[PDB]
Amino acid sequence: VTGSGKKPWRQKGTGRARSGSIKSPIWRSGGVTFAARPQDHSQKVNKKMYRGALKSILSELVRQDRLIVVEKFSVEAPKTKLLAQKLKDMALEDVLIITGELDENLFLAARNLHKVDVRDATGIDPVSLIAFDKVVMTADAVKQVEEMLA
Amino acid sequence: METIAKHRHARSSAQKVRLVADLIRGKKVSQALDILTYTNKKAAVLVKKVLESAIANAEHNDGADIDDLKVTKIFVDEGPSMKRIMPRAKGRADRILKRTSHITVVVSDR
């Protein structure tokens, strides 16, 4: 805190409480006993535990058939409205859609649809699998994941 | 009709203004004016001006007819107080509060 380190007033004599530094947490302006610092909240998560979780997650998405796997999935042009329709026809609003190799148009559509995202095979993270109401995934991606998790 | 008037931030304590107010609470307006008129206190002149302002209000703004008109409700709340400094001696400081008061007169007829 900004101030000098001068003792505010005599130890003894004034009828006053002891007082030592004008920056004392007990005093008003200036203090904070245990001022925080920038800090790192990154946890570890074992390799085998991460994989262990994805499996428990997939193997639950089927069990609620929230995972619908498809041979090929792609939109014909970089236009959101197209994708909006595909989903409409497929009976879907909230979707993860993990594509095999990922293409330009499928990504630019959905960039603006809020409840729908599209990831490549490597981009699969745990919260998302649970996040969306339905995970699509091309049968091509399935084989990728099949191995990634061993 | 209640029809009230008042003096805000008057220079007097309240403790002082009350005492003059208390003489008037409930009288026919007619009497109060005489009472105030022969009451040797600065707060009397203050309270008078308020009472008078109240009558003229009651007169010009609502019904009027001062003759049937009584000071039915009168009080003074203590206002904000002006802090000053003077010093009594050695280097010591004395607050001294120049206290103020909010005089209020309600002059109706029922």
């Binding site: 004599g13 004034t14 | 050695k90 280097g91």
Partner: peptide, 16 residues
């Protein structure tokens, strides 16, 4: 500061 009696020795020392 301090009142004069507190500073003054004769009144303050009083019982040694």
């Amino acid at each position: 500061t301090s009142k004069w009696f507190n500073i003054d020795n004769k009144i303050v020392d009083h019982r040694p």
